Write a protein that binds this ligand. Structure first.
Ligand code: NI
Ligand code: NI
Length: 89
């Protein structure tokens, strides 16, 4: 009932605004908590409750949230976020 998919989100490199979504930490997983109207994440059609599996070259693991957070900050710097998510039906 779940589908794996890849979602590409892009904005100006080094922008002062984030991509438009917040994360719900529900260890051992992380999920999309909110997607803001008007944002790059809404344009790209990321959805609330999508499970976040990886961003760019970083697979999430409950064992290293530090590297996760560093990968998220780096994607804000480059403006490119290719997300592997699992969407439950
Ligand atoms: Ni929910
Ligand atoms: Ni670029």
């Amino acid at each position: 009932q779940f589908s794996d998919m890849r979602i590409s989100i892009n904005q100006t490199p080094g922008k002062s605004l984030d991509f438009g979504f917040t994360i719900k930490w529900d260890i051992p997983g992380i999920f999309v908590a909110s997607v803001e109207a008007g944002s790059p994440a809404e344009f790209s059609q990321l959805q609330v409750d999508d499970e976040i599996i990886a961003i760019n070259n970083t697979k999430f693991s409950y064992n290293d949230s530090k590297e996760w957070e560093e990968a998220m900050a780096k994607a804000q710097e480059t403006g490119h976020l290719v997300m592997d998510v699992r969407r439950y039906g």
